[PDB]
Amino acid sequence: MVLYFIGLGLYDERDITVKGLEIAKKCDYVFAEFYTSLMAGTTLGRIQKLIGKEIRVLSREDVELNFENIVLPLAKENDVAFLTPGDPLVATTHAELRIRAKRAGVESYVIHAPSIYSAVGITGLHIYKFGKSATVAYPEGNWFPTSYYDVIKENAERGLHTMLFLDIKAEKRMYMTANEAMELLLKVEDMKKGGVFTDDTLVVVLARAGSLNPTIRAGYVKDLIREDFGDPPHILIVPGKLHIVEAEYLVEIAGAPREILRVNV
Question: Shortest gap between Cβ of 75 and a second copy (angstroms)?
Answer: 16
Q: Is the Cβ of residue 9 or residue 239 nearer to a second copy in the bound state? A: 9
Residue 204 interacts with a second copy (CB under 8 A): yes or no: no
Residues β-bridged to residue 130: 161
* Cβ count within 10 A of residue 4: 22
SS3 225: coil
**161 with 246: CB under 8 angstroms?**
no
CB of 18 to a second copy, least distance (A): 4
Contact letters for a second copy, residues 126-165 (x by CB under 8 A) = xxxxxxxxxx------------------x---x-x----x
Q: Does 167 bind a second copy (CB under 8 A)?
A: no
Note whether 10 binds a second copy by CB under 8 A: yes
Would you give the DSSP letter of residue 232?
S
Q: 166 a known binding residue?
A: yes
How many C-beta neighbours within 10 Å does residue 81 have?
26
Name the strand (E) or helix (H) holding 184: helix 178-192
Q: Measure the CA–CA gap between 202 and 223, rounded to whole angstroms.
A: 10
Rg (CA), the chain: 20
- x/- site string to Na ion, residues 82 to 121, per CB under 5 A? ----------------------------------------
In the bound state, the residue with its beta carbon closest to Na ion is 130
Q: In angstroms, give the least distance from the CB of 182 to a second copy.
A: 20
Give the closest residue to 65 by CA, choosing from 37, 90, 20, 33: 33
Kindly list the distances between the CA atom of residue 228 and the CA atoms of 176, 177, 207, 225, in Å, as whole numbers in the listed order. 13, 10, 11, 9
Nearer to a second copy, 100 or 198 (CB): 100
115 phi, psi to nearest 5 deg: -120, 155
Specify the pairing of strand 234-238 against strand 215-220.
Answer: unpaired
Q: Which stretch binds a second copy (CB under 8 A): 55-63, 80-88, 219-227, 255-263?
A: 80-88
Contact 208, 215 (CB under 8 A): yes
Note whether 210 binds a second copy by CB under 8 A.
yes
Number of residues engaging a second copy in binding (CB under 8 A): 65
Does 169 bind a second copy (CB under 8 A)? Our answer is no
Q: Is 59 in the site for a second copy (CB under 8 A)?
A: no
Q: Is residue 209 annotated as involved in ligand binding?
A: yes
- The footprint of Na ion (CB under 5 A) covers 130
- The footprint of a second copy (CB under 8 A) covers 7, 9-10, 12-19, 21-22, 50, 86-96, 98-99, 102-103, 109-110, 112-115, 117-119, 121-122, 124, 126-135, 154, 158, 160, 165, 209-210, 212-213, 245-246, 248-249, 252-253
